[PDB]
Design a protein around this ligand. Sequence first.
Ligand SMILES: NC(=O)C1=CN([C@@H]2O[C@H](COP(=O)(O)OP(=O)(O)OC[C@H]3O[C@@H](n4cnc5c(N)ncnc54)[C@H](OP(=O)(O)O)[C@@H]3O)[C@@H](O)[C@H]2O)C=CC1
Length: 476
Amino acid sequence: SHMDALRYHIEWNRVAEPGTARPAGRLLAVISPDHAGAPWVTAVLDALGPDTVRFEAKGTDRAAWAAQLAQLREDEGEFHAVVSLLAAAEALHTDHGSVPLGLAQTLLLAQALGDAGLTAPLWCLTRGGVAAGRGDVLSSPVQGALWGLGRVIGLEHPDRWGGLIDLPETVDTRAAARLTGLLADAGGEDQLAIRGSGVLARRLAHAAPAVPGSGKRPPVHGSVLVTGGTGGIGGRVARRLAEQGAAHLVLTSRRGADAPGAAELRAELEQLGVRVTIAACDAADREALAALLAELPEDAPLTAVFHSAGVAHDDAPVADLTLGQLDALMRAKLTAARHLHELTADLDLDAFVLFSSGAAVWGSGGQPGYAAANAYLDALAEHRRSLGLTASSVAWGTWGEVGMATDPEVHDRLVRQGVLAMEPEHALGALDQMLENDDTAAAITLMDWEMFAPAFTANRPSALLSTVPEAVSALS
Ligand SMILES: NC(=O)C1=CN([C@@H]2O[C@H](COP(=O)(O)OP(=O)(O)OC[C@H]3O[C@@H](n4cnc5c(N)ncnc54)[C@H](OP(=O)(O)O)[C@@H]3O)[C@@H](O)[C@H]2O)C=CC1
């Protein structure tokens, strides 16, 4: 129950139908002009009406947009809300190959709105960026990344953040009226999915307790690939896999066998009877991943991937983050997980496990780029399930003992927010509960809700935490 207590999941609950009147003040719609053709972008522009002012966000030029926005705000006076359709730009930015153009443009729009003093709440619309409601299909993991950024905008700029709304693929008049009614007043909700059945909103809940055996997890066997396998959590994952039956562990990281601690890790694993391969290669390098897969023993086919590669450093507040910082944070997450997905789809793996973060699940100030990068992982795991493929996303809280949060700097701030350091064995024992259940998505975190809830909600309420009774109690 100690391990059950670490597991949470995202659910979607029905909320009230909104009012029937459109907003009284003027809306400002923001369009990516090369990527304004999708049906849902037309349906949304039509629902906003012809009195809505339209801003075409061209390229990625913060100072140019700040100037253009300042002119609009001068001419129009205050807007009621800003409605961004930038998410429809899913093509990669030409200069930053791991950043979807719409993600870069949404960052620069949040930045330029603050620069210009346009204060109306920003709403970021997606289509297929969340899996909400029974049978729902997350069709665009790229747009799913924009939710990780948006939750961090709502932490950093709470007064000028509206929220996120996912649209259905057909935006009929019932969907349009939910939309415009939420923009009038959203009832204090800010992470919303419009579906045929109603409006759903995002919630964090404790996961159901483990059912010993219920997931038909197959025995660990053959070759298992742990990207980031020489790093802190990846090394501990590899040890556990060795103890459990893996014939062969393939560990990767940019430094490979030159990684800190690598020789000792190899010796620890080989003592347990496992074949060990340690390779040096960037998880975003598709050709190197293909070569690595082509090399596998005939008698030890790839049976599972654990994607632990990642960096969190050189992030910045939303107001300051650059596209080159965002690219570097996205590389081992979006680019590398897309390669892993595409080169293993046909292999019938037993597990495809992606390591996300609480930064992506609930949001962490100061970590927009890392939140977006991890949110892509969570969305890709739901998207793969829709294709009939296994996938799981595990959004860790804080690890103790090994890995990126052992820096007293990085450790001190997390623990002080109530995201407490987990013992490796407990974190791994909870991941094994998730994998035995074959759950698609979970956060695995030790929380002190009496510290977390009041800090997280100091400037704006969080409907997300209303389904965690300890958070409700802390706020009473
Ligand atoms: N520790 C924690 O509390 C949390 C961790 N996470 C996630 O867990 C995973 C592991 O974190 P952790 O073990 O703590 O961190 P570490 O820094 O210990 O390990 C991360 C590893 O990824 C490798 N790596 C980084 N970039 C690339 C890349 N482009 N290609 C291949 N390898 C790369 C690093 O090696 P190299 O530099 O040699 O490439 C290293 O092996 C990360 O994805 C992280 O985001 C999430 C929440 C909390």
